[PDB]
């Protein structure tokens, strides 16, 4: 199945205390592999999955340096933004950056990303063609015009189309053991009588990887949406994931409903039926 | 591996 690599960066001003808090993480699909935290002791990019630990000293020195420069750029960015939005030095503000790339099952390039938020709203993003920009509003138009003149996209594109995917390739290869495993979900169904007249049927999907999953309800073999709760996929905390789906059903009708699970780890999708 | 060049806004 397909794969990605994404870095996420976050800075948060804190006028009165020191410099902005800067937090950066890198992921390959759903596995975080590097982190940097301006507030931590070591002042270094640190490993977070066994397979990146293989990289030699020059990697760590280099990545530390590059992540530092990201942070220092965000530092300037906070200010320039404060300015464009005539905001006072008093308030705390947040910049957020994310970029990276997707490849298909053949590891050939598929899509590139680069985007930028100010105080929790878009600000500027590189369109899907990696050749033009979307400015979220009028202030961002100043950036877009700057970055157009500066041929910024051209550089971004070469990275995303090339360097990004080559490194993703390397990572996947080196991380074969873990990253291209697929963990089928362990599935079961629970039943709780909500009253004399109703009962909840909850369909569980535990310990799976990747995080991409679909749980759907059916009644008499037709897609069932009404009276359905479905929660956000959540990390188990040991590298795998959980989700659940529930329907409330009239008591005595439990046999009509079936739960359907699809996940790349499963040769054919599962159907579960309350199993009295 | 991180981008080396980050353009300011």
């Amino acid at each position, epitope marked *: 199945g397909s794969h990605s690599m994404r870095y996420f960066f976050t800075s948060v001003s804190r006028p009165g205390r020191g410099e902005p808090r800067f937090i950066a993480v890198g992921y390959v699909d759903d596995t975080q592999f590097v982190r940097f935290d301006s507030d931590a002791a070591s002042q270094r990019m640190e490993p977070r999955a066994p397979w990146i630990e293989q990289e030699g000293p020059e990697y760590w020195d*280099g990545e530390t340096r590059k992540v530092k420069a990201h942070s220092q750029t965000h530092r300037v960015d906070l200010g320039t933004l404060r300015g464009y939005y005539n905001q006072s030095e008093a308030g705390s503000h947040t910049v957020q950056r994310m970029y990276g790339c997707d490849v298909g099952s053949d590891w050939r390039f598929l899509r590139g990303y680069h985007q930028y938020a100010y105080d929790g709203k878009d600000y500027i993003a590189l369109k899907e063609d990696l050749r033009s920009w979307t400015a979220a509003d009028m202030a961002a138009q100043t950036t877009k015009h700057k970055w157009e003149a500066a041929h910024v996209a051209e550089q971004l594109r070469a990275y995303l189309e090339g360097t990004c995917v080559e490194w993703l390739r390397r990572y996947l290869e080196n991380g074969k053991e873990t990253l291209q495993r697929t963990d089928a979900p362990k599935t079961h169904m629970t039943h709780h009588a909500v009253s004399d007249h109703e009962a909840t049927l909850r369909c569980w999907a535990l310990s799976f990887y990747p995080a991409e999953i679909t749980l759907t309800w059916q009644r008499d073999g037709e897609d069932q949406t009404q009276d359905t709760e479905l929660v956000e996929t959540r990390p188990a905390g040991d590298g795998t994931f959980q989700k659940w789906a529930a329907v409330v059903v009239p008591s005595g009708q439990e046999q009509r409903y079936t739960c359907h699970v699809q996940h790349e780890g499963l040769p054919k999708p599962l159907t579960l039926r309350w199993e009295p | 591996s991180l981008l*080396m060049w*980050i353009t300011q806004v």
Partner: antibody
Amino acid sequence: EVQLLESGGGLVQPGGSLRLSCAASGFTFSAYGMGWVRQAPGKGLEWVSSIGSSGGGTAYADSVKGRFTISRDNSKNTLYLQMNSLRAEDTAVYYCAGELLPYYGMDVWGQGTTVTVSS
Amino acid sequence: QSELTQPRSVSGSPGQSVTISCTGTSRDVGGYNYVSWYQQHPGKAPKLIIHDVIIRPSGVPDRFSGSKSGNTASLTISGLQAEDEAHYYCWSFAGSYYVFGTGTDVTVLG
């Protein structure tokens, strides 16, 4: 016995192409950001373009935006600079140079090569 | 793009100190701690003498030092010597490009 050795540069007409090569030896080439810095006679150091590592690279000076293209082939320890639509402005010694790590600056230089753009 | 900015030329006597300012904006030299200085002797390639504002590469002599304070970076040479007469260039990261300074001319008086 570090050595960057510039080639592929002579005289070229205005609007011409030229493509410079830089054979590199005695340092681990794939650890180094690679770059070009040029120096017109009488005048000061410029900075044309740089490529990184690893991830990172490429970037170009505003005076060469989209005329120039940097590239690297480690399986060959060689660095490339495609130079098209050359104006007289571009007349200089071009130096091949490395950085030991990101943002370090150029700590390994070539001897330089000469590019004259003229009719 | 643009600039850096150093005095056209600074001079001094043997044994003396000399300083070469190099000034930019909050956006390059004021933006980051990545300034480096180079030395270039007549018809010879540049050589790196400072990096990361303050560090000297293993190799270079003890009487060279870098510093920076706001948007100006400085290079002090102390105990000046004949073979120090040369051109010096600062140079800084600026996020999306590198930019050399306009270069200075160090002389040794008398």
